[PDB]
């Protein structure tokens, strides 16, 4: 009878309305899906408690992050800081 939803609303990768089956990590704001949350380079699945980068279309891991950046835009030098990286938070739970 009752419908309890506490997510953003629409996806940032697909046109599917986010329901109680997203099972995604707490991103900056725009949330994705359990399938729409993949690397834009190696396409590997993300971990928990690790670092990652957010782009315009998809996201990037910490494995090919040093490559994706240089092939797109952004290089702080060979050993120099090019910016900041975020850590994947805890996966959103539908109840608990």
């Amino acid at each position: 009878y009752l419908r309890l939803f506490g997510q953003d609303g629409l996806c940032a990768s697909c046109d599917k309305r986010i329901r109680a089956y997203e099972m995604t990590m707490r991103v900056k704001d725009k949330v994705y899906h359990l399938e729409c949350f993949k690397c834009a380079a190696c396409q590997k699945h993300f971990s928990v408690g690790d670092r990652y980068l957010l782009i315009n279309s998809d996201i990037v891991c910490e494995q090919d992050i040093y490559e994706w950046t240089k092939i797109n835009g952004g290089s702080g030098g060979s050993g120099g800081s090019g910016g900041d990286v975020m850590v994947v938070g805890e996966p959103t739970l539908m109840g608990g």
Binding site: F46, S47, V48, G49, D50
Partner: peptide, 25 residues
Amino acid sequence: EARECVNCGATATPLWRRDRTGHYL
């Protein structure tokens, strides 16, 4: 890869079991 294990190294695991310290299992 995505991460390493303390006993094996199955990067194909569905979800890494991480504790308070950081024991990636």
